[PDB]
Write a protein that binds this ligand. Structure first.
Ligand SMILES: NC(=O)C1=CN([C@@H]2O[C@H](COP(=O)(O)OP(=O)(O)OC[C@H]3O[C@@H](n4cnc5c(N)ncnc54)[C@H](OP(=O)(O)O)[C@@H]3O)[C@@H](O)[C@H]2O)C=CC1
Length: 179
């Protein structure tokens, strides 16, 4: 089984982990408190500290909020070359001078940041997306990483919508707030 990483242990990390397992992946979780977080996951999931989880996979969902990204900054060297999937949303349209994905890319300039899955609710990961809204919008400045995340979306039974460069991340982040 291919191993996919998730940082964080909240509602989104838990739902993502469900879908990943159902779709045939092995999951490693990076948590600040893995002994405590382990009870929030099945035994088949490897729950560990961030620095250990990162050694087990090259593709990591960053299932934490933007305001906590800098808690990972000391992992910069270990994260070099890895794909980081920015799943985040904000409470306001155009909330910051840069999109959350661009902010993450600036914190980890030698990682490969891909925006994706922010439009998917926790409940949609558990039940599946509505038949008329299986779309997940994906973008990245790195074409190879973009294509890997597109293929992951397909394996998770979503319809990936390739919006090209990371410049698309801003309006992808605005989309849940628009109607
Ligand atoms: N909930 C949803 O339905 C959806 C959420 N998202 C996005 O997913 C991401 C997570 O959302 P959600 O699960 O609801 O968020 P939570 O508020 O549950 O936070 C998730 C994780 O953040 C981690 N973390 C929290 N504080 C810190 C910190 N100070 N430093 C380092 N890590 C920290 C915790 O992990 P730990 O304690 O294990 O370290 C926690 O389990 C967000 O970006 C959200 O916008 C996207 C679409 C849907």
């Amino acid at each position: 089984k291919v191993t996919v990483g998730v940082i964080g242990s909240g509602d989104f990390a838990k739902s993502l982990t469900i879908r990943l397992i159902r779709c045939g992946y092995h999951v490693v979780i990076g948590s600040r408190n893995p002994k405590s977080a382990s009870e929030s996951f099945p035994h088949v999931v490897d729950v560990t500290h961030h620095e250990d989880a990162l050694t087990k996979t090259n593709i990591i969902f960053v299932a934490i909020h933007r305001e906590h990204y800098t808690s990972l900054s000391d992992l910069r060297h270990l994260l070099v070359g890895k794909i980081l999937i920015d799943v985040s949303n904000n409470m306001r349209i155009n909330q910051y001078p840069e999109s959350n994905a661009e902010y993450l890319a600036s914190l980890f300039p030698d990682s490969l940041i891909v925006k994706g899955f922010n439009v998917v609710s926790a409940w949609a990961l558990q039940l599946g997306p509505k038949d008329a809204s299986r779309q997940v919008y994906i973008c990245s400045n790195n074409i190879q990483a973009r294509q890997q995340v597109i293929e992951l979306a397909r394996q998770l039974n979503f319809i990936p919508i390739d919006l090209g460069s990371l410049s698309s991340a801003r309006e992808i982040e605005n989309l849940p707030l628009r109607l």
